[PDB]
A paper describes a structure:
The S249 site is reported to be phosphorylated by ULK1. To provide a molecular basis for the binding of these LIR motifs to Atg8-family proteins, we determined the crystal structure of the WT LIR motifs of PIK3C3, BECN1, and ATG14, as well as the phosphomimetic S249E for PIK3C3, and S96E for BECN1 LIR motifs. The determination of the crystal structures of GABARAP chimeras containing phosphomimetic LIR mutations S249E in PIK3C3 and S96E in BECN1 provided us with valuable information to explain the increased binding observed upon phosphorylation. The PIK3C3S249E LIR bound GABARAP similarly to the WT PIK3C3 LIR in its C-terminal moiety (from residue F250 [PIK3C3] to P256 [PIK3C3]); however, we observe some variation in its N-terminal moiety. E249 (PIK3C3) formed a salt bridge with K48 (GABARAP). Similarly, the phosphomimetic S249E mutant of PIK3C3 interacted with K48 (GABARAP) via a salt bridge. The S249E mutant LIR peptide bound much more strongly to GABARAP, GABARAPL1 and LC3C, and even bound significantly to LC3B. As shown in peptide array binding assays, the increased binding and broadened specificity of the S249E mutant of PIK3C3 extended to include LC3B. Thus, in vivo phosphorylation of S249 may enhance the LIR interaction in PIK3C3. Using phosphomimetic mutants of known phosphorylation sites preceding the BECN1 and PIK3C3 LIRs we revealed a marked increased affinity for binding of BECN1 to GABARAP, GABARAPL1 and LC3C with a striking increase in affinity of the phosphomimetic mutations at S244 and S249 for PIK3C3 of up to 19-fold.
Author numbering:
A (entry chain A), B (entry chain A), C (entry chain A): -13 to 112
Write the structure that this text describes.
């Protein structure tokens, strides 16, 4: 109708991870499988900023996160790795889905890790 | 005891939706059923501000939200439809319950939509 | 690797509740069991601030929370019991785990209450 607003659907390939552009698949999978052997109780995570976000960027992309660490605990870690105000927000995006903070990184990894053994998380304040 | 605080229970009919006051039930249900036929993969949502909230109001009440859109994605949409600061918060309330942002609007609709085929969401910063 | 960051694991006994230090177990359990008899549809909750948090402290530690109250509703209650700005954040921690706001306090109590019939919640903005 004229008074309804038709909500547009977000483009699922809007977020492009630089780590996937610069490294071919076989190199990434070989790297992720080695890190899984060295740290079987940790999960390799790629964290990049959404290009539209205006909060600070990350010095390092790659993180070895323990499986029992929750998403909420990982949220406070990433905040203390970028330049932002205490009042600024930050949201994690895994396949454009904000994961529950009560879930562990191991549960989030086991459900959404890609074929290169890496879990890709985008962050943005908007 | 004297040192305990007895937490009061929030009145479940504190939130009154204006769309339900101005339109009788048969008119709302006939409107919601038509919009479900025209857009079977979308859900009609009524979004109104809690009267006590001091953040900006909504120009439009009615939204046709795709079923696969998550609550978190719908959260960013409503923020970009009202006047508020980047530091201001916003929370959705469905029957005075804050829905999980990881849930899809279709799942939220199928569980809480009323008899007029509409899903009612209240928002407030407090 | 040199480019990975090894995420440290948070000390689970970092948070010490003052209510447990000042009162022995038998006194706390006897207090919690009495309050469960007087209010079978309410749950006793101990809320204390994490020492590292810079937001305001709580005048009262002990709260009798109805079982059907959600964590999100209890979140707004605690905000209106301390000195903080509208832009300041606040997070609940139960065993260093941020509980889902959609869960009820009764569900959260039944899963995480300790042997003294009390549910211990820590809060902090960081």
């Amino acid at each position: 109708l004229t008074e309804f607003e038709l909500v547009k659907v977000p483009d699922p390939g809007s977020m492009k991870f630089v780590y996937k552009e610069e490294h071919p698949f076989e190199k990434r999978r070989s790297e992720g499988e080695k890190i899984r052997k060295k740290y079987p109780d940790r999960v390799p995570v790629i964290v990049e900023k959404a290009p539209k976000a205006r909060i600070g960027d990350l010095d390092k992309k790659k993180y070895l996160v323990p499986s029992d660490l929750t998403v909420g605990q990982f949220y406070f870690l990433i905040r203390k790795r970028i330049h932002l105000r205490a009042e600024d927000a930050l949201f994690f995006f895994v396949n454009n889905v904000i994961p529950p903070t009560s879930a562990t990184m191991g549960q989030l990894y086991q459900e959404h890790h890609e074929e290169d053994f890496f879990l890709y998380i985008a962050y943005s304040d908007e």
